[PDB]
Write a protein that binds this ligand. Sequence first.
Ligand SMILES: [Mg+2]
Ligand SMILES: [Mg+2]
Ligand SMILES: [Mg+2]
Ligand SMILES: [Mg+2]
Ligand SMILES: [Mg+2]
Ligand SMILES: [Mg+2]
Ligand SMILES: [Mg+2]
Ligand SMILES: [Mg+2]
Ligand SMILES: [Mg+2]
Ligand SMILES: [Mg+2]
Ligand SMILES: [Mg+2]
Ligand SMILES: [Mg+2]
Ligand SMILES: [Mg+2]
Ligand SMILES: [Mg+2]
Ligand SMILES: [Mg+2]
Ligand SMILES: [Mg+2]
Ligand SMILES: [Mg+2]
Ligand SMILES: [Mg+2]
Ligand SMILES: [Mg+2]
Ligand SMILES: [Mg+2]
Ligand SMILES: [Mg+2]
Ligand SMILES: [Mg+2]
Ligand SMILES: [Mg+2]
Ligand SMILES: [Mg+2]
Ligand SMILES: [Mg+2]
Ligand SMILES: [Mg+2]
Ligand SMILES: [Mg+2]
Ligand SMILES: [Mg+2]
Ligand SMILES: [Mg+2]
Ligand SMILES: [Mg+2]
Ligand SMILES: [Mg+2]
Ligand SMILES: [Mg+2]
Ligand SMILES: [Mg+2]
Ligand SMILES: [Mg+2]
Ligand SMILES: [Mg+2]
Ligand SMILES: [Mg+2]
Ligand SMILES: [Mg+2]
Ligand SMILES: [Mg+2]
Ligand SMILES: [Mg+2]
Ligand SMILES: [Mg+2]
Ligand SMILES: [Mg+2]
Ligand SMILES: [Mg+2]
Ligand SMILES: [Mg+2]
Ligand SMILES: [Mg+2]
Lengths: 118, 221, 48, 120, 116
Amino acid sequence: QRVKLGDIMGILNKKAVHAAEELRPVPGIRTGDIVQIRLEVPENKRRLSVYKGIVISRQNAGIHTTIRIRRIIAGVGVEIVFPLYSPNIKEIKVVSHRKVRKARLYYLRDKLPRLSTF
Amino acid sequence: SVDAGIGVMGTKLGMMSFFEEDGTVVPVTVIGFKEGNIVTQVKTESTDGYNAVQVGYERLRDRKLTMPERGHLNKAGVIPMRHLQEFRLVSVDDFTPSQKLLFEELFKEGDMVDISGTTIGKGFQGGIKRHNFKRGLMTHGSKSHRALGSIGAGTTPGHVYKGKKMPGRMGGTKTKIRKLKIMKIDTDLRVVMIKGAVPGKPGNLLRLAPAKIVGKNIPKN
Amino acid sequence: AVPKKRTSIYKKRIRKNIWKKKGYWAALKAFSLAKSLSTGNSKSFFVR
Amino acid sequence: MIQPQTHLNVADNSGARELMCIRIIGASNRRYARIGDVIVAVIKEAIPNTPLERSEVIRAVVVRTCKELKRDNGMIIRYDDNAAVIIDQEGNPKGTRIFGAIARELRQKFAKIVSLAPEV
Amino acid sequence: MKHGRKIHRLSRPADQRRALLRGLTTQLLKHGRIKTTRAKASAMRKYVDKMITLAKEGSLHKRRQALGFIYEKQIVHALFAEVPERYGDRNGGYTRIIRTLPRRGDNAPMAYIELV
RNA sequence: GACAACUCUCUCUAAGGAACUCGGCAAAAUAGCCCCGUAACUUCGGGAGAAGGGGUGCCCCCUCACAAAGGGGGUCGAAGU
RNA sequence: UUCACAUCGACGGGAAGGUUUGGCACCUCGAUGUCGGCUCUUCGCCACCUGGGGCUGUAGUAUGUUCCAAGGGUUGGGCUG
RNA sequence: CAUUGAGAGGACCUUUCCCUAGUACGAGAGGACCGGGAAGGACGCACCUCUGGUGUACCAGUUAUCGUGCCCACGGUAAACGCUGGGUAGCCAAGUGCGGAGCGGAUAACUGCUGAAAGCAUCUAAGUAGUAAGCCCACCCCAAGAUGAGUGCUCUCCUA
RNA sequence: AGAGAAGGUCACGGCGAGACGAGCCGUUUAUCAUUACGAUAGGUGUCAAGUGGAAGUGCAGUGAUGUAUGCAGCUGAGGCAUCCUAACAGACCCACAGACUUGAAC
Ligand SMILES: [Mg+2]
Ligand SMILES: [Mg+2]
Ligand SMILES: [Mg+2]
Ligand SMILES: [Mg+2]
Ligand SMILES: [Mg+2]
Ligand SMILES: [Mg+2]
Ligand SMILES: [Mg+2]
Ligand SMILES: [Mg+2]
Ligand SMILES: [Mg+2]
Ligand SMILES: [Mg+2]
Ligand SMILES: [Mg+2]
Ligand SMILES: [Mg+2]
Ligand SMILES: [Mg+2]
Ligand SMILES: [Mg+2]
Ligand SMILES: [Mg+2]
Ligand SMILES: [Mg+2]
Ligand SMILES: [Mg+2]
Ligand SMILES: [Mg+2]
Ligand SMILES: [Mg+2]
Ligand SMILES: [Mg+2]
Ligand SMILES: [Mg+2]
Ligand SMILES: [Mg+2]
Ligand SMILES: [Mg+2]
Ligand SMILES: [Mg+2]
Ligand SMILES: [Mg+2]
Ligand SMILES: [Mg+2]
Ligand SMILES: [Mg+2]
Ligand SMILES: [Mg+2]
Ligand SMILES: [Mg+2]
Ligand SMILES: [Mg+2]
Ligand SMILES: [Mg+2]
Ligand SMILES: [Mg+2]
Ligand SMILES: [Mg+2]
Ligand SMILES: [Mg+2]
Ligand SMILES: [Mg+2]
Ligand SMILES: [Mg+2]
Ligand SMILES: [Mg+2]
Ligand SMILES: [Mg+2]
Ligand SMILES: [Mg+2]
Ligand SMILES: [Mg+2]
Ligand SMILES: [Mg+2]
Ligand SMILES: [Mg+2]
Ligand SMILES: [Mg+2]
Ligand SMILES: [Mg+2]
């Protein structure tokens, strides 16, 4: 039988994630994880950037599933979002995991610097 | 109006993203297709004074149709269908009834396309949302906050000008989005992917036809 | 505001007949409800 | 998202501490500005015994914004402050050293600032 | 406009909605048949089916929810005793609505609601 | 009953923070108790709660509870008058 | 630089327009509510910018003066009621 | 049901940079017309995949007090959330896409070609060609109450 | 006069349509399958998603409390299945082959 029209969103959403997973698997990430991301930069060719920090959110949106990474560089706080299933991301690690009690760590924007330094 | 080519009709299903090989993101809109996309009638200048062709869509149960509409479709031996729209052209020498219209034969890849459908109905809205008027002060004793203000000069002219931008119904009408790039085709699922937004919510009808440009495709005047 | 002058006699009536015209549509609903109730077949309306 | 009367920090070794934007440059009749946009600014706090005085009018470019900067690959950048770097007409900074990270989008207009930065 | 908003307002704030519907279920589950308006009856189907769904999974965690919802204490203890034998096979649709003539004072469309 | 504009009575509002405006009008913020520390000027009475900072929950012990306060230790939360 | 008319043009003259200050006191005294500002328009050209030309004491860039042209556009602030 | 479009409206806006080219010009400084290609501004038509606001559907934390016999656990109130921390759909912009095209027509100012009256000359009182963000059409929406009420396909008009 | 043409309106169940009217979808829910039409709303089941680790019990601790059972528990305005309840009853308007002239056909 064919595919019903009310389900095509899930199929395309499920199909792309399956292709990206076999091409590049990804572990299970939750709020509070401390990760280390390696992503290709088409501007240069030789090396790749290395961004790390604590996960302060995880928005589930299918193929465009995101994670926000807070980390303090050069004394100033910096929050960056990363789509998990992008082809630019070459490698992800999970260094450790902090104990938390919420889904989104927005309070750290007002807390001290040491809570986000790495 | 005169169209540059022949289009079809589909239904909005939703909206999502599309990751390229290099990694660029593309906000893409999805459009499905029901069963029926068959031609119903062919018009000519000898009969109607203009050249065009009808197209039906969204097959349904026969009992739901009015009996006049049945005879219109039963002439060409065509299944029952709900909607009907035309596509005006310059020449219709290569079209007949009972003819299917596959979109992949007409829209291959990266082709600009003019989407058209019904917008979201906002209802009886004011001037700030409809006509983008500015707002009055919220403090300093002002009584008028979201009102229009003056609607005329005074004794001269002595009446309100016609077509004055005033409240009323907003949305729910027909629009057309021009020059949208097609990203990908998928004949397995019978679905098409187009960059950008589309008027309406999922389940809404629309027509997509080749992009018409003034001096290139259509006859100038 | 305030009216400049008084409404005439027949312009008044034309506006009253519209108010009365609503009774025409209310009577049809009642007749449809009775004939749809004097048969004892509707299981969605308890009249007692 | 830098409106006039906005108090900005200083990232370079120019010898200033705070600025106040009054106008925008490059964008015709625009009122806001993102990273990479040039602005006219007014000093409000300066370092003692430095070439820059307290109430000078200067040109500068935004390097950090608390508003989010979107990229093409879905990545987004966000800072926890608003800052800028003074410049000349050519666009080179007066300060010899730079603080804070800089985005890679400035290389097309301001490559000198990208080089002097500690990180990117 | 209310596009995508599925909620019965009943011309009352939230504190009164949460009490009005909560109070009618106490009367229906003990009487089995009441006379109310049609707007109140339509909003009632969502909550009566919830309490009946708790009785199918007649556990202790599911009982404490009904006690917080249902005002009186004896009906909840009596509700779980009879529903598994009465609705041991039905899957949803635990009530019907029968229309009725309106009232004399305000022409409010009235209707009965009962448990199948 | 319904849940359009618009008005009034209320809540929140990204980035910026008086650029509004005749005018910071209005709104917002501050707030209690216990400690630390409090200027010019002065009719020596005041100024003064000046300003400006720290602490604040719950549990155990010190402790004999001495009605208190204080000290030590532990623990929950983004946030303890 | 010589050359009245590239650009200014004294001395005087002839006009249009109805936005200035005024003259007259014709409508309104059993009422035609004011200055400025906010909001929201809409027309006119005697053209500030944008389009297209002529002349130049226009090399070029940039102007200057003037013709067609009113389609569109004509910022945010400090002081002041 | 599908439609022609008399008429009507909306929108056709604009800056900078690069290439041509440090070329033409000019002693040198300095620095192009035309043409082409990018990035913006403002405005407009849409959209919620993305980033977020709100979200008195919902989830969680917590102060005081009343009640459910009491502990545990829950509920009510602290206007129209007790105060806060998050939030799907929806709505929304700060967010996301698109838009402004024409070597099409006729002109204004101006430049002209051919060439009389006037054996010369003259852009013209015959004829004709270039050419403006302007005018008309084309682009987008409405539209036969356009009483000038249109056009086309299909259907129905039973019984005595 | 009888009877109810096409078709329209009310009524019944609803909406990404809407001030009210209007407009749109649906009104016994199919059977066959290489195939698309017969699930409107609510409920139920399931999934995405949101919040972020329920109750009870056991363990550790003098205790506050922590910890295991446990991606738990709750929610699920959304998607897909499922006729479980309600679209029952039915009502009104409506059917002169389209006057008269002229021409060409017949
Ligand atoms: Mg998101
Ligand atoms: Mg609407
Ligand atoms: Mg304003
Ligand atoms: Mg007010
Ligand atoms: Mg008049
Ligand atoms: Mg000074
Ligand atoms: Mg009321
Ligand atoms: Mg309350
Ligand atoms: Mg704000
Ligand atoms: Mg001002
Ligand atoms: Mg001011
Ligand atoms: Mg005040
Ligand atoms: Mg206050
Ligand atoms: Mg003090
Ligand atoms: Mg003082
Ligand atoms: Mg005058
Ligand atoms: Mg005068
Ligand atoms: Mg009078
Ligand atoms: Mg002029
Ligand atoms: Mg026309
Ligand atoms: Mg027009
Ligand atoms: Mg969104
Ligand atoms: Mg969404
Ligand atoms: Mg939202
Ligand atoms: Mg008690
Ligand atoms: Mg409570
Ligand atoms: Mg309580
Ligand atoms: Mg009480
Ligand atoms: Mg109350
Ligand atoms: Mg309140
Ligand atoms: Mg929020
Ligand atoms: Mg909240
Ligand atoms: Mg000649
Ligand atoms: Mg000659
Ligand atoms: Mg001539
Ligand atoms: Mg033109
Ligand atoms: Mg009939
Ligand atoms: Mg109707
Ligand atoms: Mg259902
Ligand atoms: Mg989940
Ligand atoms: Mg537990
Ligand atoms: Mg969950
Ligand atoms: Mg569901
Ligand atoms: Mg079935």
